Every structure is written in C-alpha cells, then in structure tokens.
Design a protein around this ligand. Structure first.
Ligand SMILES: Nc1cncc(NC(=O)Nc2cccc(Cl)c2)c1
Ligand SMILES: Nc1cncc(NC(=O)Nc2cccc(Cl)c2)c1
Lengths: 304, 304
C-alpha cells in the first residue's frame, strides 16, 4: 500500500554522466559506448545564445576544444559531429559502465525519470511527464543542461530526453537523444511561449484507479458516462480528450478493480464539476496526471 | 527554476541490495562490508507473526538457513546475530561496491530517499519524511521489507531507515540500521494505531521559501506574526509548534529571499485560515511538508 511519485533507480544512468566543457561553458554529457552526447549549445557564449549559427560556431571548434571528464579522469576526444541540436563526441574509450540502451522519442503524456546533474555529477532524481504542450516541469538550474530523462525495462535504459533550456516561464524544453526538440522549441535565447498545458486525462484516470487499489474510494460515484459526454466536460476543463485507445490501455486497471473505465470517467467528471471540497486523493488535493497506466500497474505490482 | 520532490541518486544503494530468504520468507537485505542487514521477521512464517518470540524462533535457525543472493550469485553466511529488530548476517565476502557509510537515527520531520526493492532488486526510488507520529507514508508491497531509506553527503551514504511493516491504516513502520523501531511500533501482526499525523511546520515554511525563489509569490501578504501567535494557529491546524531552532534553521532561506521568518509565518497563518481558494503553490493544492530547509537549499543551489 501507498502510492508515491517514484523514479526508476538511477545507478545505470549515473554510470553514464560526464562533464563536458567548451570554452567557458560547462554542462553534462551522456557517455554511451565511445560517444558522449551533449547539447550543442555547449559551444555558445551567453552572447552567442541570442542568435547562434551553430554550423558556423562549430567550424571554430576542434576535438581538443571539447573537454570531457568522467569522474576525475579526462577522456580523449577523437571526433565530433552535430546531429540536430546535440553534439556527439567520439572518445577513445568505450564507457565500461554502458548499460543496454535505446534512444526513444516519447509522446506527450509519457512519464520518465530525470537524473539532474551538475558538472557531470548527479544531484538528484525525480519523475516527470512530457506535457501535452511538449514542455516538462522539471527542476533545473544553470549547469543542468545535458541531464537526461529515461525509462528502464528491467536492464535496458531507454533514453528519451536531454535537457537544453528553461523557457522564460520556468518550464523546460529539450530534445530526444537524436537531438530533435520535443515540440516547437529552438536552442536560442528568444521569446518562445508554451501552448496550453492541458491535463493528461488517461493519466488522471490511471491515478484514480491507483487510489481505489490503495483504499481511497470516497470519490467513487453511482454514475457512468460515455466518451463523447465525458470529452465535452474534459474540453471545458482543459483536459486532453480520451480516446478508445486510452480506454483500452486502462483495461487491466479496470479488470483489477472491477470499475468500468466509463464509470471512472463519470467519477472524474464529478470531481471536475464539484471540486475536491477540501478532501484529498492519495494525499493530493489536485488530480495527478504524471502517472501513466503502465506506471500504476508497475507500482501496484512491484516490477524491478 | 522548478521545484520537484527529488530523491538522491540511488546507485550507491543499488550496489548494496541483496535478496535474503529464510524458509518460505523472501525479503531484502543491505550488504555493507561483510554484513547483510535485514528485518528479523525474515525468520517468521505469516503464522508466527501473530505473536513471535524472536529469540526462540532464532534458535531453530542456522547460518545455512539464511540464503543470501547478490545478483545471481549466492553469498556464504558464516555468522548471524540479532540486534534489536534486525538480523546481521556475516558473509565471507565484503561487498565490493560498499560505499562510505554511516548509520544514523533521524528525527521526525527529516526527509530521506527510499529505494523500494523486491527480491533484492530495486524497483524505484522516492522521497519520504519521518512523520511526527514516527510512521512514513511509503509505497511498499509484500516483499519490500528490508528496503532502506538514506541520505547522501557527497559520497557518504547515511542509512536511516529499514522497512519492516505496513500498519492496518496503510502507513509504514520501520527501524534505524541498529534495528530500533522509529516510534512505538513492534514487529508483530497486532493492532498498532498511529498517533496524529501533524504537519511539519518548518518544512512547509522551507517549501514556501522555495516557492518564492521559483516565482510563486501570490500567497505573500503584508502581515507579520510572533512565534507564540503563530503557534496558537499551528496547534489548531494540527501543525507542529515552531521553535527558535526552526527559525534559526530557516535563516539562510530568509536571507536569500529577504523575507523574515515571522513574515513567512504570517503568510502561512493566512493560508491556513483562508485556504488556497483553488490556487496552487509549486503546482500543489496543499501545503507540502516533505522538504526540509536543507533540501530546499540543496535543490535551489545544485549540490551533487
Ligand atoms: N535555470 C536553468 C534551467 N535549465 C536550463 C538553463 N539554461 C538555459 O536555458 N540555457 C539556454 C538559454 C537559451 C536557449 C538555450 Cl538552447 C539554452 C537554466
Ligand atoms: N504491503 C506491505 C507493505 N509493507 C510491508 C508488508 N509486510 C508486513 O507488514 N509484514 C509484517 C506484518 C506484521 C508485522 C511485521 Cl513486523 C511485518 C506488506
């Protein structure tokens, strides 16, 4: 019992973090095999950030200008290239601690763990979700760029995010491990405003199921609804529309609790329309949307 | 910017988790040097749990009855002893991955990270606080016993908790690494109810400071209060009394934000008396009390 915002154990990713310096700029890099991945903006001065021409700024950089340090030992850089918004630094030593890994590009609503790093050193780990507006609400300070987001499937680490920037609103933007930004964001110190941060409906429903499994049942009502009726209310409350795919994904949770997906939708509809009335669900006073249906199953079943 | 419920990177502790089996009972153990620590209730059948006489049950156990497995390799047990509610299993091999470590007994209000494990395998990491009633609100299933709580000071892991049980209320109880339970709890399947789960006032104030640092300032008011006046309101709302020691501990946060501790107390007093009015502070609709003043400083400064 109990339900917590839980991150994956970070050891496998801690073994991949290195420090990358280019001129006066120091940030984090991810060392997998003989390659170190990092944000390409490591080549910029805070002055270049206003309007950087990365191809041009890169011409003035050589392998010996990228200083890569793993622990207290320097790695030898034998090649460098730009792929989208990431730099790939070929080093002469394969990371001995390289876990089995994949590079995945996640969808909005997907959750992942972030290992916040500074100077190639891990400072903490927390759970995130890729917001429907393609931002993440992280906790990142100057120097945290190159910190990564990931999921673990037993012993295979799927890297899904690399931190690049903080928007003027304090929300965060980054890329997948091929250097493609999530959403419309660009690595430039310019006005970029995020779109509507809607609520991930399928995640809230998964979390309501977790609440029922853990004994918090007060919000369960005697109603049901339809996808169309529910979605009318969801739109009004800035919630993502729920599709039959989402209902299907919640099938296991529906089966384990005996609560039909549409009945849980009706409970959610009433929570939206009536509010919590000062009550809490799983110790929260707001509807949590950063647990996927897979996360709920994983936490309620004990997958290691 | 951003403020997240952040756990310490868990790699150092992942390297210490082993599986311990005694008869039909399998749980987790912590392998430090040539000793494996685990809950003594590993010697019980679910039948023994009603009224166990641990000294007596232990007489029927030999070193070869404790099966310790690290990864997929069995460790040889050459000694066993009971210290309070933990068993110490002397193995013939020092853990090669033993970090620098300490055993500390924390105070209520202190936070720590938990690496939830099953069968000696880590499944997730989350941040907790020792509640004023000496329970923790964790996320633990059957088989999670022996999972540990810890803090890290750069490279030294201070172990502060070992999981032993879930109360009939779904809250959790455990020991320090000397086997002494936090609070009045006993390792017996008997009625044990927890006391009042009061709010850790110094932690809420630290979190209000973190909110101001991160731009969430709406709740700041034009009032001040005194410790005595504030504490009258705190008592009414089941909040822990605030002492001059707590004010002192918040000094750094007060200095960094320019908000006197007693003025932040007055803001908190109004939040208690008026509620949030549907607003959020750091994306939460309730006052968070599981960040200590040290945690806020650490997260807002980037300590690795
Ligand atoms: N506090 C903080 C959190 N996360 C990242 C940073 N750095 C940051 O945003 N740097 C930067 C500025 C403009 C554009 C690009 Cl691509 C990068 C700072
Ligand atoms: N769900 C769950 C979470 N955490 C622990 C357990 N096991 C559990 O409480 N076992 C047990 C029962 C009575 C007394 C003692 Cl000392 C241990 C189960």
């Amino acid at each position: 019992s109990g339900f917590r915002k839980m991150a994956f154990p970070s050891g496998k990713v801690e073994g991949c973090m290195v420090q990358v310096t280019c001129g006066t700029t120091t940030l984090n890099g991810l060392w997998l095999d003989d390659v170190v991945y990092c944000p390409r903006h490591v080549i910029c001065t805070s002055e270049d950030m206003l309007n950087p021409n990365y191809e041009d700024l890169l011409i003035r950089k050589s392998n010996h200008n990228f200083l890569v340090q793993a622990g207290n030992v320097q790695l030898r850089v034998i090649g460098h290239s730009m792929q989208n918004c990431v730099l790939k630094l070929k080093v002469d030593t394969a990371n001995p601690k390289t876990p089995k890994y994949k590079f995945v590009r996640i969808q909005p609503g997907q959750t992942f763990s972030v290992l916040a790093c500074y100077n190639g050193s891990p400072s903490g780990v927390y759970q995130c979700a890729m917001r429907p507006n393609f931002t993440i609400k992280g906790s990142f300070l100057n120097g945290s760029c190159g910190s990564v987001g990931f999921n673990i499937d037993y012993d295979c680490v799927s890297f899904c995010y690399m931190h690049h920037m903080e928007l003027p609103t304090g929300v965060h933007a980054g890329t997948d491990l091929e250097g493609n930004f999530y959403g419309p964001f660009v690595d430039r110190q310019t006005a970029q405003a995020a779109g509507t941060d809607t609520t991930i409906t399928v995640n809230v429903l998964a979390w309501l199921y977790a609440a029922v499994i853990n004994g918090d049942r007060w919000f369960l009502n005697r109603f049901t609804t339809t996808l169309n009726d529910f979605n009318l209310v969801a739109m009004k409350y800035n919630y993502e529309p729920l599709t039959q795919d989402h209902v299907d994904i919640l099938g296991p949770l529906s089966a384990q609790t005996g609560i039909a997906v549409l009945d849980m939708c009706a409970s959610l509809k009433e929570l939206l329309q009536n509010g919590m009335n000062g009550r809490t669900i799983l110790g929260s006073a707001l509807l949590e949307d950063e647990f996927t249906p897979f996360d709920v199953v994983r936490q309620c079943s004990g997958v290691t």
